[PDB]
Design a protein around this ligand. Sequence first.
Ligand SMILES: Nc1ncnc2c1ncn2[C@@H]1O[C@H](COP(=O)(O)O)[C@@H](OP(=O)(O)O)[C@H]1O
Ligand SMILES: [Ca+2]
Ligand SMILES: [Mg+2]
Length: 354
Amino acid sequence: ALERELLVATQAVRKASLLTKRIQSEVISHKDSTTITKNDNSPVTTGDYAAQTIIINAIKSNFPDDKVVGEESSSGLSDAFVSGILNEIKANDEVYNKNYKKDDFLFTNDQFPLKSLEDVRQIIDFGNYEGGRKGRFWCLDPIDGTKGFLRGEQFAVCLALIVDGVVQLGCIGCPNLVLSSYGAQDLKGHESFGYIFRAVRGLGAFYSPSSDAESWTKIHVRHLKDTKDMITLEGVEKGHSSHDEQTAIKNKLNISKSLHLDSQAKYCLLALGLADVYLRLPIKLSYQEKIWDHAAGNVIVHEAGGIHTDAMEDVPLDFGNGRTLATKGVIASSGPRELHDLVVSTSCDVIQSR
Ligand SMILES: Nc1ncnc2c1ncn2[C@@H]1O[C@H](COP(=O)(O)O)[C@@H](OP(=O)(O)O)[C@H]1O
Ligand SMILES: [Ca+2]
Ligand SMILES: [Mg+2]
């Protein structure tokens, strides 16, 4: 099961990973024309939109009826802005097809040719599904960690398939990820556009350099015995999680090592066995996490042998509630259960002591 879906997800993420790697420096340099502010003041760039367009167009060319929950919308974009999205797509195609073309795989077809400004708008807006409890849908964050992208640091291209509220398939491109930065080994070909991580429920978790994406290496969480030796994974942006409460947890558990980076690349490092505990405590309890921020990681961490819950109740995440998660915060770990429950119960106690 899901063999065709896995191929499509992988190639879609692969092409978008090249585009976003290549753009990163020009967006930052031209970040007066390439960057828009959304209704919540968060940034969105030509890259986010271009990645969403490539990925949804590939999904639709292969699965015409499929539903997609994608973060971005084309509403209000000018023709000038949309022509820039199209240009970046076609510029990337010219590099990608010389070098990385996959035989017998289509990114576009007769019904979804991706030729005009109007095609771009239509494809972006196929991401307007609201999710829910029954049936099959794709879940897409075209650039997870846009603030990291803009900082020239880490970001991820994230695609998942949800069926009956459960994540069945996940694929995360980490285009700027260099494992030696974390003291670990890099694989042949990693330098051009990073790594892809993927998993299908029941079938294990794997990775490959993005430029390869043909030879897959199986991954698994590690198992350290004492928390004193462990490493946390946390975000960089102080407004996205409660860093001081995370520090309280670390101190209580005698953890003295942490890696800060943007995006679901954090789940990939956990699944690879390079750290032990992902912490994302909520600053404001009114916030509802978006499914696209966690869905691909959920199945990858599970298939790598880890555990994924909220930050307070210690319950599984429920991906059948619409666009958002109803629980508060997120914690993932290598397990075992006893370790995971120690962490989440500490998190609960810290939050309740406010
Ligand atoms: N107040 C908040 N609490 C939790 N997450 C937030 C937040 N405000 C924005 N975010 C989200 O944080 C997601 C993952 O964060 P991080 O990279 O820090 O781990 C982001 O990727 P986007 O670039 O898609 O927004 C973003 O949706
Ligand atoms: Ca995003
Ligand atoms: Mg995000």
